[PDB]
Nucleic acid binder design. Sequence first.
DNA 1: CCGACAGGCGCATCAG
DNA 2: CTGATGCGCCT
DNA 3: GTCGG
Length: 322
Amino acid sequence: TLNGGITDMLTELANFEKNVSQAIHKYNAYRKAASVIAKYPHKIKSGAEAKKLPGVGTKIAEKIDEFLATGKLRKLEKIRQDDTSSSINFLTRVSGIGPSAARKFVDEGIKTLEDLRKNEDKLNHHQRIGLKYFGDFEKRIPREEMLQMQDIVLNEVKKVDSEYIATVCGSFRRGAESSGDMDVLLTHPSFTSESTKQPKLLHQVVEQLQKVHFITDTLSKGETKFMGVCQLPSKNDEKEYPHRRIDIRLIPKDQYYCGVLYFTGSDIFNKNMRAHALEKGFTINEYTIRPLVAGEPLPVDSEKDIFDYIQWKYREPKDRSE
DNA sequence: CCGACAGGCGCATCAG
DNA sequence: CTGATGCGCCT
DNA sequence: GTCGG
Ligand SMILES: [Cl-]
Ligand SMILES: [Cl-]
Ligand SMILES: [Mg+2]
Ligand SMILES: [Mg+2]
Ligand SMILES: [Mg+2]
Ligand SMILES: [Mg+2]
Ligand SMILES: [Mg+2]
Ligand code: NA
């Protein structure tokens, strides 16, 4: 891509700040810069040109000048060569290991995938599964497989109760050619913000998906959110499909539009949109849009209504990507 | 200069 | 046990 | 790390 070198540099720095420094706002500032630069429709020629973009300040522009002059960043060169930094970064690639646990593990001498395997009894359940499927979870999912997974989940939900509506969101809904995982938003009429008229609405779907061997493991599971692993069936003599991450979110039926907006992302889009909601005197979460101490939920009966409240032209899901 | 930076589910842990 | 805190995760 | 007021 245009400015790929620059945006890669910034993403690496963001990951360093998140994973090693544990500085979430630096992480986010680097990602905001990477994002704005990725959308910039010109080959950046200097740091001063980039500095004109919102989210790119003096320090980034200075890094960009270094990167354009030399093709590298001494700061990242040092980070790359630093054994502890690299180890901590690596370990965070395991689902369930974040910055804190990564640092703790690296302090205890646990530096490698090899080390994690021989110390399974130091891992919680989520981390165990993340280690088990480490190579699989870094593989992306072609949209063709996403379509097959969608067919399974939609038909199996329908067998449980014809009144459930399952909507595949995330990058899939944004029209992406490949997805990192599957995100399923679920509603049922018995569950609204005013009442839960049936218990175990999510459990029943998760259980049905387990019975047919689609869901293979569970990372976490409560009344409204499921985080797990699933796999497509393969045919006689074929290599197995990789195991895949699947998230299911049961959202009150009358709060579907706020739910789908949230679940469609992108993550950066959601942060930008919620940050602009705040500037306009609103707060948005996956349930509601409220005036600001937040007040009572405003009426919504489309995704567009939410954009309208904050005075944004509608963006189609396909235009909410990075 | 500097306060704010999106919002929240599930789970592990801690105090009492 | 409850209630509070923070981690790691999701978009 | 960045930026609006
Ligand atoms: Cl974030
Ligand atoms: Cl709410
Ligand atoms: Mg991780
Ligand atoms: Mg993601
Ligand atoms: Mg996804
Ligand atoms: Mg997901
Ligand atoms: Mg947090
Ligand atoms: Na700028």
